[PDB]
Design a protein around this ligand. Sequence first.
Ligand SMILES: NS(=O)(=O)c1ccc(N(CCC(=O)O)c2nc(-c3ccc(Cl)cc3)c(Cl)s2)cc1
Ligand SMILES: [Zn+2]
Length: 257
Amino acid sequence: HHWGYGKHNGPEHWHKDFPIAKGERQSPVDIDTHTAKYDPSLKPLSVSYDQATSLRILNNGHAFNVEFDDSQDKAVLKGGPLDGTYRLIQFHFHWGSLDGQGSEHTVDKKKYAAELHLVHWNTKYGDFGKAVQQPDGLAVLGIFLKVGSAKPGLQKVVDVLDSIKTKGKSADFTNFDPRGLLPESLDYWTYPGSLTTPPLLECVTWIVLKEPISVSSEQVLKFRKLNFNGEGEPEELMVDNWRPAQPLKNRQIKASF
Ligand SMILES: NS(=O)(=O)c1ccc(N(CCC(=O)O)c2nc(-c3ccc(Cl)cc3)c(Cl)s2)cc1
Ligand SMILES: [Zn+2]
């Protein structure tokens, strides 16, 4: 009886196995755009993905992860609110069963169809597993998805999904350029938070871009064909794999703009 999204093991249950679910810096949160404070001391975000090495795509039973080579100073995030260098390890999404829901963060209570998380770890801590034990261990770049025109830089992901339908399936996934998932503007909100899945560790500097990307209905429909179950188990569509907004508590969300 492990955690999930389902009718009986979803977010409202996580606290029993992961008490930190009721912690002081949980994510996601609703971004109240009028209360976010512009911080002129915030720097432009530096996204350096030209040398990114994607390796594999994996259905982990909760989402799919596009994994990168993070054994060298390739694909890093710096600047913004960050001190030092964070290296890209993977990206994944959260999405809904319908277009009207799926994002984890919300903006003035608006839900987006989906949200992309580009996960990076602080090089000061030497790898990802040690980084998650630190308050400044990770930086996750969150990007909202809205349904409209297709995102041509997403299609290579969409088309491989049928090869990783079920939990535990993986596929080679080389030469994928995550720059094709970015919007034009890097304006952002930032705040200290957590992983949004178990173990829910309080180790993340969240950087949420204001400008959403567009994807087509066909692209998100293909996300919704994935399965949470393993092959040869009853089919459970991989939909609504998002944690709802958590209490902001004693936090300030800062805007770069
Ligand atoms: N949604 S989010 O907050 O960006 C987000 C970002 C990252 C994760 N992942 C990947 C989980 C997976 O693929 O199953 C974590 N893996 C670990 C982990 C650490 C140590 C070991 Cl030995 C094994 C796994 C975490 Cl701790 S967090 C989950 C949510
Ligand atoms: Zn995520």
